Write a protein that binds this ligand. Structure first.
Ligand code: HEM
Ligand SMILES: Cc1ccc(-c2ccncc2)c(C(=O)N2CCC(O)(Cc3ccccc3)CC2)c1
Length: 429
């Protein structure tokens, strides 16, 4: 092989972790084609903080199409041509301005209040409750309203077919005749929903309804001269999926881990008590004052990044950390791997929020749960605000105990998520 000379072996992220440990900062692997996992901070900096390095489209191909069905296609995540990317990124950026996000505070509050009232009613310390499912309904209900102006009402038990579609498509990215059929139909369903909600927005505008400027406004604008709506739909599916799935799992992971950290939980309860009190509504400014909750969520992303990493195309032969890496090679970056290396993090398996305390030295290119550079998460602040609002309201009102038997392990599709449904029993504070 042109790759035989590179060090390497003569959940998949965990295998990568073991190999990076065993073999060093530049290791050859198999994802889908041969790629090279690069785990030095210097390398992270060089490749992610430069606009000379583009994503590798061959590696995103499994998000563009699934069993011949267009999924993310040429939307904002999976578009690897720089110009095309840059054009749509800059247009859609408008929906994530400071004042756009601040105005979502009402939506975040309402959906979080609804979740908490639903959980309070079950808080008999006996009824098992899937926090993964409940957090996913909350994130979807937030996204639909926030990004598209629609009310899915999943918290109320609506949109079960839609829930099913999502589940089946996620399984499909990582994979008979029958599962093949369930997958295709699901992807087509979600694009059909896209055509549905797009039609409504356009009717509204035509009939001159009040039209909140949101993410949907901006993805419409991005496509002013397209001959068809394929680009538009690509972005619909992208935001629909990216905008809830990882938020949901970040919340779920946080709740799962916190269930064996009672001292940390008591600290979080104290913080929430002291800043917001008994208030039902968190002000934008309150978010800033929840400093310890903010550290907890960061540490949760260190050990449990739902978006595990990214790929860049190495265009020409380059020496990386003493290793010759051939022209035309997918470079694999993983915040999951790096977060669990003792050479980057002291006692890496210890959940310690103090790593992110003010005055603690900041991780320097060893932690990137939203990636870094020009292709970093456009929804970073949106996600941070929403998960802070959900967590703060849970902590205000409820105590959680993981049902015994629930595992701490992971499953890996395209993203990482709890292996188990995070079944908990609950009591009011
Ligand atoms: C905890 C929640 C989230 C995490 C951990 C996360 C993580 C990431 C990561 C690692 C990337 C880079 C992906 C790549 O290089 O292939 C990314 C990009 C992106 N994320 Fe997120 N994300 C989150 C929430 C969101 C939300 C709420 C939205 C939308 C409202 C969103 C939309 C996107 C989009 C559109 C991109 C591509 C942007 C570009 O290339 O310019 N994400 N995210
Ligand atoms: C199904 C799905 C759901 C959400 C997101 C999502 C979330 C929030 N923001 C952005 C995207 C993504 C998704 O596109 N990603 C970026 C890439 C990856 O990190 C790793 C990966 C790269 C290539 C192939 C397989 C994995 C995984 C997450 C994919």
């Amino acid at each position: 092989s042109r790759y035989e000379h590179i060090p390497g072996p003569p959940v998949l992220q965990d295998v990568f972790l073991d190999w990076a440990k065993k073999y060093g900062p530049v290791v050859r692997v198999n994802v889908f084609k041969t790629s090279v996992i690069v785990t030095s901070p210097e390398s992270v900096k060089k490749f992610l903080m430069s606009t000379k390095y583009n994503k590798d489209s061959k590696m995103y191909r499994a998000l563009q199409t699934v069993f011949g069905e267009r999924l993310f296609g040429q939307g904002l995540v999976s578009e690897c041509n720089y110009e095309r990317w840059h054009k749509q990124r800059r247009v859609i950026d408008l929906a994530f301005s400071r004042s756009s996000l601040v105005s979502l505070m009402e939506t975040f509050n309402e959906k979080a209040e609804q979740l908490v009232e639903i959980l309070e009613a079950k808080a008999d310390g006996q009824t098992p409750v899937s926090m993964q499912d409940m957090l996913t309904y909350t994130a979807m209900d937030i996204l639909a309203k926030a990004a598209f102006g629609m009310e899915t009402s999943m918290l109320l038990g609506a949109q079960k077919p839609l829930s099913q579609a999502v589940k089946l498509m996620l399984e499909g990215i990582t994979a008979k005749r029958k599962q093949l059929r369930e997958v295709r139909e699901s992807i087509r369903f979600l694009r059909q929903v896209g055509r549905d909600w797009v039609q409504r927005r356009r009717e509204a505008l035509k009939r001159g309804e009040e039209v909140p400027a949101d993410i949907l406004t901006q993805i419409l604008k991005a496509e002013e001269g397209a001959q068809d709506d394929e680009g538009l739909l690509d972005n619909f599916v992208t935001f629909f999926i990216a905008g809830h799935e990882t938020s949901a799992n970040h919340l779920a992971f946080t709740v799962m881990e916190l269930s064996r950290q009672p001292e940390i939980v008591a600290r979080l309860q104290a913080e929430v008590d002291e800043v917001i009190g008994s208030k039902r509504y968190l002000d934008f400014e309150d978010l800033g004052r929840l400093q310890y909750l903010s550290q907890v969520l960061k540490e949760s992303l260190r050990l449990y990044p739902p978006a595990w990493g990214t790929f860049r195309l190495l265009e020409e032969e380059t020496l990386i950390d003493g290793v010759r890496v051939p022209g035309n090679t997918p470079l694999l970056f993983s915040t999951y791997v790096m977060g669990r290396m003792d050479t980057y993090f002291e006692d890496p398996l210890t959940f310690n929020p103090d790593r992110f305390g003010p005055g603690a030295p900041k991780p320097r290119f060893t932690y990137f749960p939203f990636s870094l550079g020009h292709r970093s998460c456009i929804g970073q602040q949106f996600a941070q605000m929403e998960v802070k609002v959900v967590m703060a309201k849970l902590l205000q009102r409820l105590e959680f105990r993981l049902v015994p038997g629930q595992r701490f392990g992971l499953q890996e599709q395209a993203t990482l998520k709890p292996l188990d449904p995070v079944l908990c029993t609950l009591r009011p504070r």
